[PDB]
Amino acid sequence: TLELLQAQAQNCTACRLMEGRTRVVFGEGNPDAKLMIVGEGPGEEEDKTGRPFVGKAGQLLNRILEAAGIPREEVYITNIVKCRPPQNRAPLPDEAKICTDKWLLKQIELIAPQIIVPLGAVAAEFFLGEKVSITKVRGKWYEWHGIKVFPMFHPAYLLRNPSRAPGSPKHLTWLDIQEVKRALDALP
């Protein structure tokens, strides 16, 4: 089951990211979610609580979600890597391959989401199968193993570029989440 996998993951030591971690942030939400959200990796508060997206950026994600009528508990959230990399740096392709082969793939298999929303360049590069620019793939529909992928700016990116101006990352994000909502409501 997904909960045996979650349980096991707590003792994972497959990549060097295990050295600095406090808690492993495997993931949470609806086990049979139609929508799965995947980010880069955990941060300070995530490392401390073992829960994904609970810090400053995670609180944004919550807001962005409810602003589209999407209840957080009905979706499943995770990241490419489960352990907090030193000083919040992005995960190396090294640890990204290992963690993803050990957990992400099975999580996706067990949950069988119909839409995958990758947050940030790292996550997007995983589902697109190639190096990419988040600003270019953001807001467009893709496909990965039969499932619909829809890349979006990571909430942390919005904190770093807080502009409320038209066409700004925050404005575009708002439009994108609505697009995810329309897509969700049109699923068989």
Ligand code: SF4
């Ligand atoms: S990041 Fe993933 S692979 Fe690396 S130690 Fe944590 S759970 Fe294991």
